[PDB]
Amino acid sequence: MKGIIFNVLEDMVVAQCGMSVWNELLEKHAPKDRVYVSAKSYAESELFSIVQDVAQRLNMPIQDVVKAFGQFLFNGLASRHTDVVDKFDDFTSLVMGIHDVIHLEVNKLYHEPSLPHINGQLLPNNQIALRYSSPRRLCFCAEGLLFGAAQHFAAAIQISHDTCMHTGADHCMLIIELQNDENLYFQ
Numbered sequence: 001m002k003g004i005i006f007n008v009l010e011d012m013v014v015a016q017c018g019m020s021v022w023n024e025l026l027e028k029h030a031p032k033d034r035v036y037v038s039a040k041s042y043a044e045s046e047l048f049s050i051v052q053d054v055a056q057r058l059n060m061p062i063q064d065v066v067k068a069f070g071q072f073l074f075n076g077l078a079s080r081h082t083d084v085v086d087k088f089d090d091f092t093s094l095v096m097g098i099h100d101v102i103h104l105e106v107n108k109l110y111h112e113p114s115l116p117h118i119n120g121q122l123l124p125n126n127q128i129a130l131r132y133s134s135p136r137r138l139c140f141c142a143e144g145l146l147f148g149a150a151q152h153f154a155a156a157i158q159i160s161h162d163t164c165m166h167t168g169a170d171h172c173m174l175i176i177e178l179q180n181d182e183n184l185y186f187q
């Protein structure tokens, strides 16, 4: 798990809960003097432990917190990699380019990142079938990231997530419905 994910998580915790809370989390869940260098890889268990601790403090379902993080994360990533996001003029383009364009670039920017496998298929009625696969099972982070992307393009979406690795499949299916964006009028 790259430092950049931890750095965006810090911004979130610091913004919502305060710096004193982040330092608690970090002292408790990370080795002494840990510093997350944005480009370096770190044990994903440190990220999961921090986020689980937050979920418990807030008495929220863990996957609801991961999803909220995901949505915060989209802007954290777009603002730190603005040249990658500015390759797309709308939400649907970006989603269709996650694998072959965005995460292709992430392999040139970072040494050996740990990324999901994603394939998007355009459906009728302004829907997208996004297939997600990862041993890290962060499909709810992916839901949040899609909601973040929607907000980035002033779009409105809904997601159905009825095949899921957490319910025993070897992939998740996220069926994205684009309800509105700047190029959608009546239908």
Ligand code: MNH
Residues within 6 Å of the ligand: 001, 002, 004, 005, 074, 077, 078, 081, 084, 085, 095, 098, 102, 103, 106, 110, 112, 113, 114, 115, 116, 117, 134, 135, 136, 137, 138, 139, 141, 142, 143, 145, 146, 149
């Ligand atoms: C919506 C769009 C979108 C989705 C659904 C998305 C999906 C994900 C998910 C889920 C993970 C966590 C790991 C896993 O195995 O699931 C992940 C990781 C990552 N992605 Mn992307 N990602 C972006 C946009 C997206 N990515 C953008 C924009 C950037 C920035 C250029 C980016 C860069 C990354 C980096 C960096 C990681 C972390 C890799 C690592 O920790 O080793 N990405």
Ligand code: NA
Residues within 6 Å of the ligand: 180, 181, 182, 183, 184, 185
């Ligand atoms: Na519109």
Ligand SMILES: [Zn+2]
Residues within 6 Å of the ligand: 139, 140, 161, 163, 164, 165, 166, 171, 172, 173
């Ligand atoms: Zn899932």
